[PDB]
Design a protein around this ligand. Structure first.
Ligand SMILES: NC(=O)C1=CN([C@@H]2O[C@H](COP(=O)(O)OP(=O)(O)OC[C@H]3O[C@@H](n4cnc5c(N)ncnc54)[C@H](OP(=O)(O)O)[C@@H]3O)[C@@H](O)[C@H]2O)C=CC1
Ligand SMILES: COc1cc(Cc2cnc(N)nc2N)cc(OC)c1OC
Length: 157
């Protein structure tokens, strides 16, 4: 099963200067919970931002770079390769993978971050005409998690 995993704000911002625009530990716990034991496919800039492969899942990086051979990362050089990956595969970002994949995935796990951040990278527009809300769960706030957010799971109609 092929899924998107993304956090985006009220205007679909995902990213600023190759980093997440917000500090939201609870989103990152959500990401850990969902993707542990599965596979992640991310483009090269997302990989560099994170800087290491994430533990306890297959990390797959998409890059035209044929010298890319990183310890604990599988490399693919085409979108077409994503389909040969076994198991539950999460399209992990960033902008350019989302744009390529949004029409192809079974479902999306979206954290809607309920604020308006400066961004330089966006998730593509989508409509609920196309996507059934399987679930919608308000994120709990505390002093360390102070931005309202909602976890959506959307299934393509
Ligand atoms: N909020 C969220 O949920 C998430 C946010 N982000 C954010 O997104 C931003 C980065 O996004 P973006 O700039 O689009 O970059 P990406 O992370 O998507 O990666 C860009 C690169 O991916 C590689 N790539 C993508 N498509 C292909 C292809 N078909 N063939 C070969 N290589 C390909 C290329 O690498 P090369 O040039 O090396 O060939 C390309 O330059 C960051 O700010 C980051 O913080 C990222 C993930 C999630
Ligand atoms: C695990 O830490 C990171 C995760 C992500 C991707 C990501 C983050 N949040 C959500 N909801 N979905 C995603 N695909 C992107 C990151 O930086 C660009 C990360 O470093 C902080």
């Amino acid at each position: 099963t092929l899924s998107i995993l993304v956090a985006h704000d009220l205007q679909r911002v995902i990213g600023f200067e190759n980093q997440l625009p917000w500090h939201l530990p609870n989103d990152l716990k959500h990401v850990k919970k969902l993707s542990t034991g599965h596979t992640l496919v991310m483009g090269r800039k997302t990989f560099e931002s994170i800087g290491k492969p994430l533990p306890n899942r297959r990390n797959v990086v998409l890059t035209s770079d044929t010298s890319f051979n990183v310890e604990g990362v599988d490399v693919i050089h085409s979108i077409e390769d994503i389909y040969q990956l076994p198991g539950h595969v999460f399209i992990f970002g960033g902008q350019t993978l989302f744009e390529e994949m949004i029409d192809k995935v079974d479902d999306m796990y979206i954290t809607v971050i309920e604020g308006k951040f400066r961004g330089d990278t966006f998730f593509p527009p989508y409509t609920f005409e196309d996507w059934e809300v399987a679930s919608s769960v308000e994120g709990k706030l505390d002093e360390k998690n102070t931005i309202p957010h909602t976890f959506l799971h959307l299934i393509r109609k």
